[PDB]
């Protein structure tokens, strides 16, 4: 509109209205020029291309993009406490995005006639990089100014080489809106229908569903021999009841398993050898081995073991100001899934035992361990929990088939997720004036809630702040102004029957 | 209801996570209901 | 930490009505103890 009139205001707040919540967040961003306005082929060979597991081919682009895909972008630590204590489920409904108050600089002075190119990809024609849990998100704390990440993508490779099937994409080929310091940009988005995320834990376990007071009318095989001696074979049968709960017939079995190596936080219990990569669970795709991370949803450990964690099984967050490489275990936050041990097998345990032979007069019954177990009819399981620091949605790959599309790192799987929003400085002339832009961004997401109907008599487990005195307030700034989040917060506190 | 603008999470009343022989605010093996502790009303905070 | 004498009634705060003394219980609303001292409680000042 004009140079001397603001194109948008500052909106950050949370409206709690009935069964819905509306979160609003505004931040300040700074957008540099990437690749000196160029597209550049990238691969592993420029880095030496030693490992075939790490081989890649693709292109870096001059464009940047916006990422709000973590929960702490949209929720304050208090609002997150209000969500997880008071509700069984939630899910996003509507999305509103606004880009305004554009300011372009020259290297420092304004360039008033410069433009900013911004488009959203609503046909999903570009590679979708938002569901990989990359850094670069809107900062959790509203006063921090953040840098817009550079957009890049990977396509098919043979070693570091490309193939004839490899697609090249120029983002200039898309129609894009151009903004000066008086223009603004906005659009709305509608989440496709997804199931509620389950922010609760079961107060029952899959094997304990029975009435403890009453026998079943079904019989099991109690004895195959009368006693010690020769030719003592017999078949004896017994009622399954409160005395023996292991042998009772059941209608539903626990979910699938792919076993993880077990690692103790007490280090002297670990074997004295380098097992990180070699002892890892992994899958193979076209000869390349990728670690299974985080993998299928499984309980992190049995009750009474907090020290063990699956090697690649759990999401591990770094604390504020944690280094990049080879940091100690006190620098990171290892999430655990203790609430799914009711319906889900333990990650570091076998699924069970199976009969491996035909017994006979000359051969004993032999059994073997099930290390991995696919889906069987009659299974029930829980998905992975979501965290304040964690991802929200992912794009379901477009394929002939999939099963239970919920993304393994957690959150809401979608065939049409919130679209990629691409942004860059329009070049002002291979010699170019050095230039960058800054502005504001506001994002508004509407969240549907599922209220808690429980008849439980005794009080629930709630997420609480600890009262005892400390040098700092948790989820606040320190004396140097740094904001930090001291611990990961899951969503599962309230309980439901199984 | 509270409209509070506090950024950091509040203090809440919560039952203990750890294992115990009995459940707090429940019956025992003999059918005796019991209240293990007094519960006041003041957890959330306001500015003065 | 308590004194070795009986002061439950004698050391009590109280009010008098028509000659009859009544313990001041629980009394006006006041903080039970200073910050950091959880082991001290007002004699008649608390509900038990």
């Amino acid at each position: 509109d004009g140079v001397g009139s603001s194109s948008g205001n500052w909106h950050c707040d949370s409206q709690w209205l009935g069964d819905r919540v509306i979160t609003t967040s505004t931040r300040t961003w700074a957008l540099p020029t990437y690749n000196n306005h160029l597209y550049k082929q990238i691969s592993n060979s420029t880095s030496g291309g030693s490992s075939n597991d790490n081989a890649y081919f693709g292109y870096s682009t001059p464009w940047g993009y916006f990422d709000f895909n973590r929960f702490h972008c949209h929720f304050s630590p208090r609002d997150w406490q209000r969500l997880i204590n008071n509700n069984w489920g939630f899910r996003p409904k509507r999305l509103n995005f606004k880009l305004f108050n554009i300011q372009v600089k020259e290297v420092i002075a304004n360039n008033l006639t410069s433009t900013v190119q911004v488009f959203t990809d609503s046909d999903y024609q570009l590679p979708y990089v938002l569901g990989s849990a990359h850094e670069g998100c809107l900062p959790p704390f509203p006063a921090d100014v953040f840098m817009i990440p550079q957009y890049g993508y990977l396509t098919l490779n043979d070693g570091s080489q490309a193939v004839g099937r490899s697609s090249f994409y120029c983002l200039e080929y898309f129609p894009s809106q151009m903004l000066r310091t008086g223009n603004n940009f906005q659009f709305s988005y509608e989440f496709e229908n997804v199931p509620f995320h389950s922010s609760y834990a079961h107060s029952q376990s899959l094997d304990r569903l029975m009435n403890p007071l009453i026998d079943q009318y079904l019989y099991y095989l109690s004895k195959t021999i009368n006693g010690s001696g020769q030719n003592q074979q017999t078949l004896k049968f017994s009622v399954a009841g409160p005395s023996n709960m292991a042998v009772q017939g059941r209608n539903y079995i626990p979910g699938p398993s792919y076993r993880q190596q077990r690692v103790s936080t007490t280090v002297t219990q670990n074997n004295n050898s380098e097992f990180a990569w070699p002892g890892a669970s992994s899958w193979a795709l076209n000869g390349r081995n990728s670690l299974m991370n985080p993998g299928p949803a499984m309980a992190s450990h049995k009750e009474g073991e907090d020290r063990f964690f699956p090697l690649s099984g759990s999401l591990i967050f770094g604390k504020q100001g944690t280094g990049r490489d080879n940091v100690d275990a006190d620098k990171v936050m290892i999430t655990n899934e203790e609430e799914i041990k009711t319906t889900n097998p333990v990650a570091t345990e076998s699924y069970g035992q199976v009969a491996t032979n035909h017994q006979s007069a000359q051969a004993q019954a032999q059994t073997g361990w099930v290390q991995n177990q696919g889906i069987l009819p009659g299974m029930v399981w829980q998905d992975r929990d979501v965290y304040l620091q964690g991802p929200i949605w992912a794009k379901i790959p477009h394929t002939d088939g999939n099963f239970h599309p919920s993304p393994l790192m957690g959150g809401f799987g979608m065939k049409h997720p919130p679209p990629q929003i691409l942004i860059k400085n329009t070049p002002v002339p291979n010699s170019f004036i050095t230039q960058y832009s800054t502005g504001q961004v506001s994002v508004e997401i509407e969240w549907e809630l599922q209220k808690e109907n429980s008849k439980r008599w005794n009080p629930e487990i709630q997420y609480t702040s600890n009262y005892y005195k400390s040098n700092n307030v948790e989820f606040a700034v320190n004396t140097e102004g740094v904001y930090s989040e001291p611990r990961p917060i899951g969503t599962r506190y309230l309980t439901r029957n199984l | 209801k509270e409209n509070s603008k506090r950024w950091n999470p509040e203090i809440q009343y919560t039952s203990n996570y750890y294992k115990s022989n009995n459940v707090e605010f429940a019956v025992n093996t003999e059918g005796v209901y019991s209240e293990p502790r007094p519960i006041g009303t003041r957890y959330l905070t306001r500015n003065l | 930490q308590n004194n070795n004498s009986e002061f439950a009634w004698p050391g009590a705060s109280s009010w008098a009505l028509n000659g009859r003394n009544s313990l001041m219980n629980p009394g006006p609303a006041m903080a039970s103890h200073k910050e950091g001292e959880d082991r001290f409680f007002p004699l008649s000042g608390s509900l038990i």
Partner: antibody
Amino acid sequence: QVQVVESGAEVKKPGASVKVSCKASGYAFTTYYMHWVRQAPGQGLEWMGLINPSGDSITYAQRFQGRVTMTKDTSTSTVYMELSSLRSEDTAIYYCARDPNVAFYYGSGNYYKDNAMDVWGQGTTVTVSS
Amino acid sequence: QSVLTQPPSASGTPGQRVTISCSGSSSNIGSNPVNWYQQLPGTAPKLLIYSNNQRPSGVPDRFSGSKSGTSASLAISGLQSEDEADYYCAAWDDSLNGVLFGGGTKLTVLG
């Protein structure tokens, strides 16, 4: 003055049962908690059990549950500790400790009783050997 | 899975400050009061600090106690030869549902 006279040293074989008595005098026996804590010859302290001022409620360390018994005698002002099915590792010194914190504090968050024991008994050396 | 851990040894010279710390689980140090015991060789343990920072009567002012988060520390200042003893940090543990002691920290004066 307050005193906690610990019993005499003994020598026991595996499988035997040893009872250590603790005689308090100079204060009110009923009022305080009594803690039992063992210390191996070269090792740190290990808490065994607890008995409340009334004698009705007793808590044990999980390691010792079912092989330990504690009883309090108001008449002679003596607390006793029972250890059964003795093992080589059992050999230790057994301390009897008085706990002056009578009540629970119910603040915001979980409640707690302060378990600090001011008066300690001299100790008894129990050896489990053949 | 809940443990109390202290460094096995400490050292200092008379008059220097020496701090002894132990690390605890959320169930014990985090939610319960921490008490400190000092034990000289051949004698029963003596309570030094109770209820995190409180000091019992007849105990010298130089000893100090602090609790931060899930970690508890004991500070000794104006150190002397007599002070040298084994130090244990203790706390009630909810999961254990009993009292839990640290491994003990043997202090060694220099001279």
